[PDB]
From a paper:
p38α, also known as MAPK14, is a ubiquitously expressed mitogen-activated protein kinase (MAPK) family member that has a key role in maintaining cellular homeostasis and tissue organization. The p38α structure is topologically similar to other MAPKs and consists of two lobes linked by a flexible hinge, with the junction between the two lobes forming the ATP binding site. The activation of p38α normally involves phosphorylation by the upstream kinases MKK3 and MKK6, but p38α can be also activated by non-canonical mechanisms that involve autophosphorylation. Here, we report the identification of p38α inhibitors referred to as NC-p38i, which efficiently inhibit the autophosphorylation of p38α while having a minor effect on the canonical p38α pathway.
To characterize at an atomic level the interaction between NC-p38i and non-phosphorylated p38α, we performed co-crystallization experiments with either compound NC-37 or NC-38 and with or without the ATP competitive inhibitor SB203580 or the slow hydrolyzable ATP analog ATP-γ-S. Both SB203580 and ATP-γ-S have been reported to bind to p38α facilitating its crystallization. As for p38α, we used a recombinant protein that contains the single point mutation C162S, which facilitates crystallization by reducing its aggregation. We obtained well-diffracting crystals for three complexes of p38α with NC-37 or NC-38, two in the absence of co-factors and one with SB203580 bound to the ATP binding site. In the absence of SB203580, the NC-p38i molecules occupy the active site, forming an extensive network of contacts independently of the presence or absence of the fluorine atom. The amino acids involved in the interactions were very similar in both compounds, with residues V30, A51, K53, L104, T106, L108, M109, L167, and D168 forming the cavity that accommodates the ligands. All the solved structures were unphosphorylated, with the DFG motif at the beginning of the activation loop in the active conformation (DFG-in). We observed that the Asp side chain of the DFG motif was oriented towards the ATP binding site and participated in direct interactions with the compounds. Interestingly, this hydrogen bond was absent in our three structures, and the helix comprising residues 182–188 (where T185 is located) was also poorly formed. Therefore, the absence of this short helix and the hydrogen bond probably contributes to the selective inhibition of p38α autophosphorylation observed upon NC-p38i binding. Intriguingly, we only observed Y35-out orientations in the complexes of p38α with NC-p38i molecules, suggesting that this conformation is the most favorable to enable access of NC-p38i to the active site of p38α.
Numbering used by the authors: 5 to 171, 184 to 353
Amino acid sequence: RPTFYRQELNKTIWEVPERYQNLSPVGSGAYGSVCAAFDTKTGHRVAVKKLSRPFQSIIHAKRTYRELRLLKHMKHENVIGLLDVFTPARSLEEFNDVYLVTHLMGADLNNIVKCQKLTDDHVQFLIYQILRGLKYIHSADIIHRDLKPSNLAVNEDSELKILDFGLATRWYRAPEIMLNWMHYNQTVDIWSVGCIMAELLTGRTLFPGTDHIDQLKLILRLVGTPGAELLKKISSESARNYIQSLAQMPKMNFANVFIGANPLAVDLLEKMLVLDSDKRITAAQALAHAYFAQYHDPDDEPVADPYDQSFESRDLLIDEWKSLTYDEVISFVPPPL
């Protein structure tokens, strides 16, 4: 249906619907190159990403499909959504290029945290929105695994969206995935949320480790060494023995570490930053914590539709991966705006 027009930007052809005007490069990452544009239909500024060599191998073809499937599925106020996806190809035989369109995201959360204490009311609202987003994501059996301030967009009204899905810094990474304990669940992302919240409250990174070793030491300084209960849940003897080497450390009183902070905030942090992922608070549980009393509404914290991930275990040829992606592109329907 739409008319396409072609132009040179950077060192390649961009061929996009005429609704998108005034394209100008903003950057280019490992996966794709990104242009800002003006959408004349909706009247918004947008980001147009052209994927790089999406079907170069089976690894990359499966990656393209995986990401497109997830981006299409995610429909929630606190999670990046897909405005449009298109190809200039008029058939599968001519299919090569894939373009993703999203809202032009403003500053990330680091920009807001200029090494200063945010007000408690500000922290409440930001952390509420992250957890609300995570509840949705986790309900689709997805784990982020690399949640950090730079993966969080915030606009002028303090409205927050989670930018990536985890398809530089280890400061926010849960220890059970650092140390390869093979004892983890979705609460790996909750650890990250705890690190982010603490930083927002103090203005300082909670565990600024210089390397893997120093990271662990800093963590155990605050939360204490693992108890026998957790030791026997860790599978590998290497990880088990490595923990048994380090000397015993008491769990610290968080109220002394976060002096002056809302006592409800301290209590939530204590539930977030525990080593045993079987005892770590989940997103749904954290939303019901008294800290978020003013924001919490169970009927306005939705879960995702069931998410079919059976493709992960299939072994297909490269043309099949490309064919499946093509299907997802041409059958795309914009969200009801």
